[PDB]
Paper text:
Here, the crystal structure of [name], a c-type cytochrome co-encoded with other proteins involved in nitrite reduction by the opportunistic pathogen [name], has been determined. The iron cation is coordinated by His24 and Met62, which is consistent with mutagenesis studies performed using the orthologue from P. pantotrophus. Whereas NirM is absent in many NirS-producing bacteria and has been assigned to function as an electron transporter for the nitrite reductase, orthologs of [name] are found in nearly all NirS producers, but their function is subject to ongoing discussions.
Because the wild-type protein failed to crystallize, we attempted to reduce the surface entropy by mutating Glu71 to alanine, finally yielding cube-shaped crystals that diffracted anisotropically and possessed a very large orthorhombic unit cell. The crystals diffracted anisotropically to a maximum resolution of 2.12 Å (spherical resolution of 2.83 Å) and initial phases were obtained by Fe-SAD phasing, revealing the presence of 11 [name] chains in the asymmetric unit. Surprisingly, these protomers arrange into one monomer and two different types of 3D domain-swapped dimers, one of which shows pronounced asymmetry. In the three ‘far dimers’ the average iron–iron distance is 28.5 ± 0.2 Å, whereas it is 24.9 ± 0.1 Å in the two ‘close dimers’. In the dimers of [name] observed here, the GloA-score is 0.9 ± 0.2 Å for the far dimers, compared with 3.05 ± 0.01 Å for the close dimers; this is indicative of substantial asymmetry in the latter, which is readily discernible after the superposition of one protomer of a dimer onto the other. In [name], the increased flexibility leads to antiparallel β-sheet-like interactions of Leu26, Arg27 and Leu28 in the far dimers and no interactions, but with elevated B factors of the hinge loop in the close dimers. Notably, dimerization does not have a major impact on the structure of the heme-binding site, indicating that monomers and dimers could display similar biochemical properties, as has already been found for other N-terminally domain-swapped cytochromes. Importantly, the mutation is not part of the dimer interfaces or the hinge loop, suggesting that it does not cause the simultaneous presence of different [name] oligomeric states observed here. However, the fact that we did not detect dimers even in highly concentrated solutions, together with the observation that crystallization took relatively long and required the introduction of a surface-entropy-reduction mutant that enabled crystal formation through new crystal contacts, currently argues for a crystallization artefact that points towards structural malleability of these proteins rather than a physiological importance of [name] dimers.
Author numbering:
A (entry chain C), B (entry chain A): 4 to 88
Write the structure that this text describes.
């Protein structure tokens, strides 16, 4: 499948397959962003990490693209677990 | 963030953030499709399940919408932990 098709297939993976099979950020190079792994951590601490990143790690700063509202919204979604598109 | 923006953030989370933070299809009502859960099952078996579903379950068949290559690609993504590009 070509790049255009790959994109259509990732969408299907996230919307249709993910509906029944669920979606979770179980962690790879970076830590898990599951509600269980973020339990009890100050919310503003997680928003800070998103906006400014973590120096000397692969976690980049997203302030270049995300406002403080955007980062807080994402963090709320990670805390709830409701990451489904 | 407004309607259109929340969607951008959901997409960003699933396809950009999910690469490092390990997006997986698991935690839903349906079974886990993580690499750990598919480790022993043959690829052609999983591809068959995608194309033909599993009778007497809600796992539907996808052959009409997906070619054999499409299904094999999807399975590779499940196996290789590459739901985010
Ligand atoms: C609910 C309507 C589902 C949707 C939509 C999708 N899947 Fe599914 N899947 C579902 C169930 C209840 C089961 C288990 C069936 C059983 O009792 O054995 C499955 C199973 C699979 C498997 C097989 C996993 C295994 O261990 O053999 C695969 C490979 C799979 N599902 C993939 C898959 C894909 C790619 C989907 C989107 C195209 C998809 N499923 C949707 C429930 C549902
Ligand atoms: C690889 C290039 C990454 C991408 C892209 C994103 N994240 Fe990340 N993240 C990554 C690493 C290696 C780490 C750990 C850094 C360290 O100090 O060891 C992180 C960390 C986070 C955290 C903190 C989690 C915690 O338990 O405190 C969060 C909340 C986080 N990252 C969020 C996040 C978001 C929202 C991203 C997309 C906008 C994103 N990360 C991308 C690696 C990578």
């Amino acid at each position: 499948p070509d790049a255009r098709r790959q994109a259509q297939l990732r969408h299907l993976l996230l919307q249709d397959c993910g509906s029944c099979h669920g979606l979770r950020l179980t962690g790879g190079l970076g830590p898990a962003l599951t509600p269980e792994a973020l339990r009890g951590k100050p919310r503003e601490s997680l928003v800070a990490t998103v906006l400014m990143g973590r120096p000397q790690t692969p976690m980049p700063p997203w302030a270049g693209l995300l406002s403080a509202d955007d980062a807080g919204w994402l963090v709320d979604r990670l805390i709830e677990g409701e990451i489904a598109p």
